[PDB]
């Protein structure tokens, strides 16, 4: 596609420039091009890809909720038509990211840190489709399955303070809470995840302690709201 004539290192360099310029569309397009070079991504490269698409899909989700709320309040075709326009572009970004994960990031991810990262993304962007979905059951089951596979590997392969593991469980609990309508599962996952991390913090450097407690605080913010 578009980035086929640019060097892999130049796409990565240009994705970093884009992040500093807050050009998240450009950042996503460069990281898409980087992935399509067909080489595995480093830890920093996985983070660039995820930050890029998260910033793009974030704008579309904020946009969608504003429009959906006006639409619901109004219950002429314009509101429904524009909500669809935004929803369709949101689905296209989700479909693009899932495309990258299936072709071929996940099947070449052997290490726990890479495979759990990619399966979490897969659950995440099926959850973004779930948010706008009215077939919905299959999308929801696709998110659960990606999340659960990630969780199984994270429990076997990573310590309980692993930030990727902590982020996975944060997101899966939010999946449980507001996608699967299983708030009790959400609360259980968030408590057990929090407490297990707490009992492993003693093992960490100052640097690692900062990293894990920041994500633990997100589990606490949610538990505060849910109970």
């Amino acid at each position: 596609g578009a980035m086929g004539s640019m060097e892999r290192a130049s796409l990565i360099q240009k994705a970093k420039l884009a992040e500093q310029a807050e050009r998240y569309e450009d950042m996503a397009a460069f990281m898409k091009g980087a992935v399509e070079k067909g080489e595995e991504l480093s830890c920093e490269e996985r983070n660039l890809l995820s930050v890029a698409y998260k910033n793009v899909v974030g704008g579309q989700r904020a946009a969608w909720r504003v429009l959906s709320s006006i639409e619901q309040k109004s219950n002429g075709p314009e509101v429904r038509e524009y909500r669809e326009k935004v929803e369709t572009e949101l689905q296209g970004v989700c479909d693009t990211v899932l495309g990258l994960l299936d072709s071929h990031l996940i099947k070449e991810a052997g290490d726990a840190e890479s495979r759990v990262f990619y399966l979490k993304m897969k659950g995440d962007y099926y959850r973004y489709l779930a948010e706008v979905a009215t077939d919905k059951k299959r999308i929801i089951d696709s998110a659960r399955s990606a999340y659960q596979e990630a969780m199984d590997i994270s429990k076997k392969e990573m310590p309980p303070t692993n930030p990727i593991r902590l982020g996975l469980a944060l997101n899966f609990s939010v999946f449980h809470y507001e996608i699967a309508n299983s708030p009790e599962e959400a609360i259980s996952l968030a408590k057990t995840t929090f407490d297990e991390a707490m009992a492993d913090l003693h093992t960490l450097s100052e640097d690692s302690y900062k990293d894990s407690t920041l994500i633990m605080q997100l589990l606490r913010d949610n538990l505060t709201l849910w109970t």
Partner: peptide, 12 residues
């Protein structure tokens, strides 16, 4: 909507 905490940029 009340949006719960999920990992990385709350860009929404």
């Amino acid at each position: 909507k009340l949006m719960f905490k999920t990992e990385g940029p709350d860009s929404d």
